[PDB]
Design a protein around this ligand. Structure first.
Ligand SMILES: O=P(O)(O)OC[C@H]1O[C@](O)(COP(=O)(O)O)[C@@H](O)[C@@H]1O
Ligand SMILES: O=P(O)(O)OC[C@H]1O[C@](O)(COP(=O)(O)O)[C@@H](O)[C@@H]1O
Ligand SMILES: [Mg+2]
Ligand SMILES: [Mg+2]
Ligand SMILES: [Mg+2]
Ligand SMILES: [Mg+2]
Lengths: 498, 498, 498, 498
């Protein structure tokens, strides 16, 4: 019982030794430096995010090279993320530089490019040609991140739409426009996005944060855009609207993970419904066994302030309580005054919330929602986590090359950390988005074939000992395959470290 | 299962008709006007709050009169709350204006009043005399809402303490000093507090928000300070330090309700632990069946901004999810630019979170934690709520003169609203702090004795019909007593409304 | 948990004060005497059963008059049961008095009445004309309570059937025949049964044990046979085969109660499957809220022996554990050597099993299987039982005239006894088949109208006090209707006896 | 929920392929023949029982040799059980043949051996010397299996006791005397018992059924009497009195298994309380993970009758439902007319009850009552059973030389059978008392060392395939250890059979 658990939570009891949840930082001017990055990584940064909505290929090249330099300096594996610009619906150019609007005025939204360069305070151009046809009277239009609200009145021309202004705001040249409720037939990947993805794939980005995902087909378009060179790179779809949350089931199946992009989602859907969307998306991603990132204003006030609001602390804590693997900073680390301090605060809230969680409940809730019969790979992974709770194991060790086994072990949310012994360095950086998983690399070319699992196994137990989780005599759960049939785990064994 | 509930949450389903949670607003310059108050009350305000940390008695009666005028104009019962200044530890005067401090400096904190008017950037005065004795080396001292951190190095004088400056901050004249992790032997009620409470009991304040409650004995001191004239006024203890959370069990038993004053609590205790304190305090207050309020900066950004942060929305939602009877606005409504808009947003998050809650689980969690045998009054009230879930009752009606029965029904957190038919107007406003309850007054002198509880019963069913909760043919649970017993409810009846 | 409950069952702890389960005795030569009946009633007999398979209308008249005399002598209400002879399939007359059969022989079963009086060890007559058509080769035929098994080989004539004998047995004149698996199209009520039911209805029998019920339509035929004079008499359908257990759902809806007639059922269906049928039928009758009688060989060895077998004791105990309201003796009391002793043993096993039962589980199991929204009558009855567990009530009092309310209170299986205050004497004798219900009669013509519930209420509390369940100061749950709308209960009140 | 399970039980659904429960038969005149034994073994006998209360050593080796011959002929492993005579309290000789007693008479029970050979209907001798001292007035004495009841009135001599005859019975020479509700200080092992156990350990009996176990110290006395030659033989303690049930916890810890000897227990303790003792003892033995047998008259009527009573069928079914590893026949197979038929009926009730059981509930009930942290051996075994339910495994394979691992897997009551590949033939027969287990022997001297557990693994999968449980493509859970550890299982693997 949550009520029975809460009555008895000690504010004076010691927190957990290890940190299970992961932190994702947006690299910007405040954090592009190799010294600033070595600072974020030391504070808690597991994944470096690049927002491609702005910035040149020379800028992001510097971000790629600087994160890799800082990571190699500290001897850590950090994931490189590419947040695509995505399909945009922007306004035209405004007459003499700007145009202001007052509550009551009758404005005209035209799709004829004649009003593109010449946009007055009475009529202006919009990128979307479907616009007058898709948007029907009574319906709403949001301009400049929902700052100015427009109500559709009547269709003037086959290109124009008569609108009522009900929010006093001044619009600048080619400002963004969002259409609530309506199904937008924009491309999955824009012309820039395809060139951005090409640069990303060629430069070795670990994962892609696919901006504005509405359908599962749109996810497949992104994987196709990645090609044979980007076959193994993760696709984390960003849910930014109604079509995201409506087709969440299909988008989960198609994607490698999901991001609750509360930023654009809060502009599309009503503010109060973003909590319900968060909870729904996060729990569906847990039953699925795919990573979940929470994303906007986690600790917003710390962009200028040295301490977060009471609200910002509960938001970081409850994202972890919900079941999120990751928590995200963007602007708090990109353009913020306290870049190291904000990550340090996030880490403390994560370890606190992690300690205030009933560890057995999350496993039993996920397990009981599982379809029986389970695949032998899944029944071995869930039972490995079951054994961990039973023997009170200080750590779980998994020999996963893809990361697919480590993700299915993390799916059953254990109390202890998961150590992943892998032969691929990409896997080391891709498990930075999955909870409780701490990767170790085994160089096959520099040590041996190790067909009989024993070097990777001895490597992992040694790492867990050094990191301070397991001491001599402690019991560890070990997951791999039997010397007979490999490619999926079937083996589970309980061993004392010593 | 919370996981199974979450995976089945619709962002497109309709919200609940009634609002169960209650909203408290701090009255300030932005909201002192009778028109501004009629605006808060229309937006969602159930209780008006008066922060006695500042403001004259002439100014506080201006708000008392204006709230009473706006309430009578709209025909509503709004509770009047007195948030006491409480025992304060302030510094001395900074000679030549202000003193500035740099990380590394050796400062002196003296209890000798010789440094009271003459406080330099090397030595200054502190209100607390028992300061060098209670605070031992290694310990921390927080100046100006914890902004400046100082660590005790050595005892210089029997009045002075040699300290190390931990951060860069500029201190003003008579700024606040908080002492983390140590028992402060300050009075429960200060000299100003006693005069404030006297004015409070005189002007007919419905409830007292007792600032900085450390022990249960301290709440009895406040009740004694209220006297025979303030016997019936509610005492809501504000948990502001580590002692409040340590003796929470005893403070609950002694108080009429509790407030999680996250503001001063976040300054005393580490930021991340305020979530654990919140959850613990809120759930303990539910098992006890006593109101619990959430407070510090919930929708903070809306003081300047017309929309809240993603964090602020989840904070309001999760306070309701935790089990909070109330949610509070301090400064957002006091000095805020959008006073009506912030309350309107809070009400929308409350109704959303209220809909995303598992109706039966909260009742069964609270019921199973109660000691058996139950008192006949409690077994009637819990079974009335059990009947409400069983018959799918659209509303519960209770005849409660004190409000103790309505609080005992709200304790079992029903899905429907609770209509309280009372003979006391104080009860109408005192139940603005309890969840689901919506009071109706029965003027005994203007209608009749109603010894056979029937005029009140017909009054209540009429109110529920008009407010739109119950339609013709709907079933209602009715709680009162028979003729052979009084003072406590005995009877429960399921009636089809005509 | 059953395992957790069992570990902790004390063989030395004191048993319950009251007996919740009921005992039904078959009246025969050993128990027809007014002194023998006063002996059964004193030992535990709540219902007197008359097996109409044998015995004249003069014999059963004596049984009716003698039970009524014994009941009036002891001042108790005992139910009079009529177990109908039912549709029979009997053999013809055997040549020179008998015919024997050996494993391997080829026998002939003819439907031509030419073989009725002349039945040799090679060919004999059977009552059922559908017989050769319905019974197909490979199928089984059971003669003389399944003692001799016959396998169908081929259809010789349109009246005859060639059979293989596979059990050495000697058949007598017009011995019984049972057809396993097959659907028998016999009448619901035979020519004798209709005259028997006429005698029963006219003599005032409280209930009818309808022999060999296969369909719900067959139940309606029995109620039609009872007419306007037998409108209020209970129909307890006897499940004696495959068609009984297959259409159990429909037979439950149509009947007033059910009897697991294990006797004929064990001859029809395989012996091991009678446990599964028992458990299924008993639990379905609990969710339905209709009485369940368990019936054959409860304590068989005690027909000749003064002590039962270890098996017979677990059978009586587990019938009570399953959820049976009643347990039945037939032959153990009818022709038995120890008629008083067998009932005395049954009562001791019932009180023991009643004490070893988790009282809360049976209520919560039944309640959670209930369809929500519940009728106001049901939500008040379940919540009255919920209140009883909560306040630890020593007894529940119900004002039921039909018995329908007392049966729905007993449906939620409370820990305490249920006292039924009724205005009908038939109701007093019909609640002898429902668990925990102990009836009290209120003579309307001899005391008053009592439109305001208070005489019946004071009558009940007095009865519970005298019987020793409630002492002064004890809390009682009282169920009736509000002075406004009667005919169904809506009122529930918790009162202290004193 | 058991109620929800029951309401969904099909009397027409197919039963389980394997039989999980085990059957024990008492060898007597009806079943001593090698052909009669080959008949019992073919019908269901897993363990052969020898009642040493009667019969010479010459006669008991005749059964030892015949069971071993019949087992070797059919190629099966059957356990040889020695049910000791135990400490007996018998009367003296009745002068002139027999003595008769009538209700009301004043009899004398003397401990002076002067009345040993000369015992009249007024005074007789009793074996127990401490009888007048231990038995105090008001107390009961049971003569000839409790048939004759006598109440102590007063102490006549320091050897005699004046008693009141409670019922009419005729006593024979040297009939048994049981003393209810008092601690009998008789030896654990009698002079005959020690010589019987010596013969037992000499002829290689697999298990000892220790008659009349009072304390845990008494079971250690029996283990001491077995010596170094009988170190590995199982000690199944027979609970026969009120002390056995009082010290059940300690008797469980000390013993290798338990028998609910309902026969003598039903004579000591009241008949109705034997159900509560059964349930308690059986469930405590499940949490402990030790075998538990049910015994006295389960299918009693079948000693003379060809079909059992309705009661006898529910008794066999409910013993399996309770959690009994074994069910026993004493006299039904020893002196019975239908020895093969009774075992055949028992097997059918076992498979029926086994099918009507909730597979997962028993596992989860046992698992949740176990102390955490679990030993690595136990967490492997429980998780192996957890995996079996998850993957829907058709069989579990265990390599257990002692049998301790197979008993630990059977402890978690899986849905499928357990195949035990052992290197000891004693283990093959000792596991005939544990549920689900079906042993396979691996002759180390005739095949190889098999240090890498693979020949045994291939042996087991082959056995499961042949017996028809696992088909091609089916998944099996395999439990053993790795090379780095031995003596206890460490590994668990899920393999698809080829
Ligand atoms: O304690 P509370 O909530 O005021 O109400 C308890 C009592 O008040 C009552 O209304 C008694 O006063 P009435 O005269 O109005 O019945 C009863 O319903 C009940 O016994
Ligand atoms: O204690 P048990 O049941 O005999 O078996 C435990 C041990 O037996 C073993 O079979 C060891 O002997 P092996 O040499 O056959 O592996 C292991 O599986 C296990 O460690
Ligand atoms: Mg976007
Ligand atoms: Mg303060
Ligand atoms: Mg019949
Ligand atoms: Mg004995």
């Amino acid at each position: 019982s949550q009520l029975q658990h809460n009555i008895g939570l000690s504010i004076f009891e010691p927190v957990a030794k290890h940190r299970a949840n992961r932190i994702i930082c947006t690299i910007g001017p405040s954090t592009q430096s190799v010294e600033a990055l070595k600072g974020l990584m030391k504070s808690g940064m597991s994944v470096a995010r690049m927002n491609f909505s702005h910035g040149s290929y020379e800028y992001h090249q510097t971000t790629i090279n600087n994160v890799r330099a800082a990571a190699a300096e500290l001897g850590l594996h950090i994931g490189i993320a590419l947040d695509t610009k995505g399909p945009e619906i922007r306004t035209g150019l405004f007459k003499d530089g700007e145009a202001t609007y007052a509550p009551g005025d009758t404005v005209l939204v035209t799709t004829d490019p004649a009003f593109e360069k010449i946009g007055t305070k009475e009529k202006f151009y919009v990128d979307y040609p479907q616009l007058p046809n898709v948007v029907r009277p009574g319906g709403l239009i949001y301009v400049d991140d929902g700052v100015l609200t427009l109500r559709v009145l009547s269709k003037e021309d086959d290109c124009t739409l008569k609108c009522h202004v009900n929010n006093h705001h001044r619009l600048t040249d080619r400002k963004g426009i969002n259409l609530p409720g309506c199904e937008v037939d924009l491309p999955a990947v824009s012309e820039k996005d395809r060139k951005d993805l090409q640069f990303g794939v060629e430069q070795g980005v670990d994962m892609i944060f696919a901006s504005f995902i509405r359908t599962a087909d749109q996810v497949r378009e992104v994987r196709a855009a990645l090609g044979e060179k980007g076959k193994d790179t993760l696709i984390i779809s960003k849910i930014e609207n109604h079509q995201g949350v409506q087709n969440i089931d299909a988008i989960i199946e198609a994607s490698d993970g999901i991001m609750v992009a509360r930023g654009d989602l809060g502009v599309e859907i009503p503010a109060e419904k973003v909590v319900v969307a968060q909870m729904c998306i996060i729990s569906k991603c847990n039953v699925a066994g795919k990573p979940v990132i929470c994303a906007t204003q986690m600790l917003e006030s710390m962009t200028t302030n040295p301490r977060p609001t009471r609200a910002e602390v509960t938001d970081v804590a409850n994202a972890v309580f919900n079941g999120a693997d990751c928590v995200m900073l963007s602007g708090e680390t990109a353009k913020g005054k306290y870049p190291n301090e904000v990550v340090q605060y996030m880490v403390r809230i994560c370890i606190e919330a992690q300690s205030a969680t009933h560890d057995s409940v999350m496993f039993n809730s996920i397990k009981n929602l599982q379809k029986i019969p389970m695949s032998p790979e899944e029944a071995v992974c869930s039972s490995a986590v079951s054994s961990a709770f039973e023997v009170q194991a200080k750590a779980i060790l998994v020999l996963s090359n893809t990361g697919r086994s480590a993700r299915l072990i993390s799916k059953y949310r254990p109390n202890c950390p998961i150590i992943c012994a892998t032969t691929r360095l990409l896997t080391c950086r891709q498990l930075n988005v999955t909870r409780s998983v701490e990767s170790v690399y085994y160089d096959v070319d520099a040590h041996g074939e190790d067909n009989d699992r024993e070097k990777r196994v001895q490597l992992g137990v040694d790492w867990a000992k050094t990191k301070g989780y397991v001491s001599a005599g402690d019991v560890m759960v070990i997951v791999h395959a039997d010397h007979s049939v490999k490619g999926y785990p079937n083996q589970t064994r309980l061993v004392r470290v010593r």
